[PDB]
């Protein structure tokens, strides 16, 4: 741990502070997350094995007196900062498609290994000058503030939710890159749920079998009609809107999986363009 030279504070992470640091020994530049229950220890040691080009590599795990340090590979920018930077112009479709395709490959890999992210958002999707995008903070939820990307089943109190929650979050992120505005900017759990309801329609037994039996479901929920989908992400083409609606299906079991999503016609002409970053 004294092998590290804090270069600067990247930002307030979800589990602690994250610093950009230099390994005094190897000289390598990394991201330091200053986060303990032995259960967490075995859980994150398992994440060390979860290696994929679209998953931010966890280089090491350092435990020392209640202090838990996670060393990750460092990327210079996150998707949230990139979106704001191209908010006036907009991220070209080719790049949006490339990014969505890569994240899906990443999710497909994690999910095949029964690992869920559970809290996907623009701030934990990291990019580099090479046109690569990666998932950061994967598996950390299982081990141990925004509700905008939270799947409805979680909001309705489902305690044993599946890999579909990541597909839903990614669907919200996909829509956000296209429109340049968060899809469902909830500022409370009920406001988050109702914003979803107002756009996709209040779910019922017809479209989501068993929904009315969910823990926090209330028969008193207002009944909103589903809105035309062409008003949600204009001017995305039909392939895109088709893929998005399948990523946002209410019923977690009907929601398209990452693997299947990779076969959707929308990615028929997928390429790997590079973004222009001002580091």
Ligand X SMILES: O=C(Cc1ccc(N2CCCCC2)cc1)Nc1n[nH]c2ccc(N3CCCS3(=O)=O)cc12
Contact 175, 240 (CB under 8 A): no
Give the C-alpha separation, 279 to 273, whole Å: 18
| Residues 137-196, interacting with ligand X (CB under 6 A) | 137
The DSSP call for residue 133 is: E
Helix or strand or coil: residue 77?
strand
For 153, phi and psi rounded to 5 degrees? -60, -35
Is residue 90 a contact partner of residue 183, using CB atoms and an 8 Å limit?
no
123 is in an annotated binding site: yes
Q: Element (H or E) spanning 9, and its range?
A: strand 4-12
Q: How far is the CB of 123 from ligand X (least distance, A)?
A: 6
Which SS3 state, helix, strand or coil, does residue 18 take? strand
Binding mask 65-94 for ligand X (x = CB under 6 A): -------xxxxxxx----------------
Give the per-residue contact string, 117-136, with ligand X (x = CB under 6 A; - = no).
-------x-x---------x
Half-sphere exposure of 40 (CA within 13 A, CB side): 16
Q: Which is nearer to ligand X, 36 or 207 (CB)?
A: 36
The set of residues, in sequence order, having a beta carbon less than 8 Å from that of 145 and lying 6+ positions away, is none
The question of whether 216 is a catalytic residue gets the answer no
Provide, rounded to whole angstroms, the least separation between the CB of residue 83 and ligand X. Answer: 14
SS3 17: strand
When the beta carbons of 49 and 228 are compared against ligand X, the nearer one is 49
Stretch that binds ligand X, among 6-14, 168-176, 227-235, 240-248 (CB under 6 A): 6-14
State the minimum distance, in angstroms, from the CB of residue 219 to ligand X: 39
Cα(77)–Cα(110) distance, rounded to whole angstroms?
22
Site string for ligand X, 28-67 (x = CB under 6 A): ---x-x----------------------x-----------
Residues that constitute the known binding site: 10-18, 33, 73-75, 78, 121-124, 137
Using CB under 6 A, list all residues that contact ligand X. Answer: 8, 10-11, 13-14, 18, 20, 31, 33, 56, 72-78, 124, 126, 136-137
Residues annotated in the binding site for ATP, as ranges?
A: 10-18, 33, 73-75, 78, 121-124, 137
Positions marked active-site: 119
């Amino acid at each position: 741990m004294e092998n590290f030279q804090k270069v600067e504070k990247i930002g307030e992470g979800t589990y602690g502070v994250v610093y950009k640091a230099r390994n005094k020994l190897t000289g390598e530049v990394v991201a330091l997350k200053k986060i303990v229950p032995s259960t967490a220890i075995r859980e994150i040691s398992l994440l060390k094995e979860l290696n994929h080009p679209n998953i931010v590599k966890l280089l090491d795990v350092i435990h020392t007196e209640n202090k838990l340090y996670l060393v990750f590979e460092f990327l210079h920018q996150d998707l949230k900062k990139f979106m704001d930077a191209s908010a006036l112009t907009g991220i070209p479709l080719p790049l949006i498609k490339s990014y969505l395709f890569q994240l899906l490959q990443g999710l497909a890999f994690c999910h095949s290994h029964r690992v869920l992210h559970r809290d996907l958002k623009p701030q934990n999707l990291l990019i580099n000058t090479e046109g690569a995008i990666k998932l950061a903070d994967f598996g950390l939820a299982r081990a141990f503030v925004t509700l905008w990307y939270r799947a409805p089943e979680i909001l309705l109190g489902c305690k044993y939710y599946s890999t579909a929650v990541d597909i839903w979050s990614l669907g919200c992120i996909f829509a956000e890159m296209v429109t340049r505005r968060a899809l469902f900017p909830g500022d409370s759990e009920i406001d988050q749920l109702f914003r979803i309801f107002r756009t996709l329609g209040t779910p019922d037994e017809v479209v989501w079998p068993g929904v009315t039996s969910m823990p926090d479901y209330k028969p008193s929920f207002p009944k909103w009609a589903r809105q035309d989908f062409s008003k949600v992400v204009p001017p995305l083409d039909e392939d895109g809107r088709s893929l998005l609606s399948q990523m946002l299906h209410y019923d977690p079991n009907k929601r398209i999986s990452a693997k299947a999503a990779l076969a959707h016609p929308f990615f028929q002409d997928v390429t790997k363009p590079v973004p222009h970053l001002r580091l």
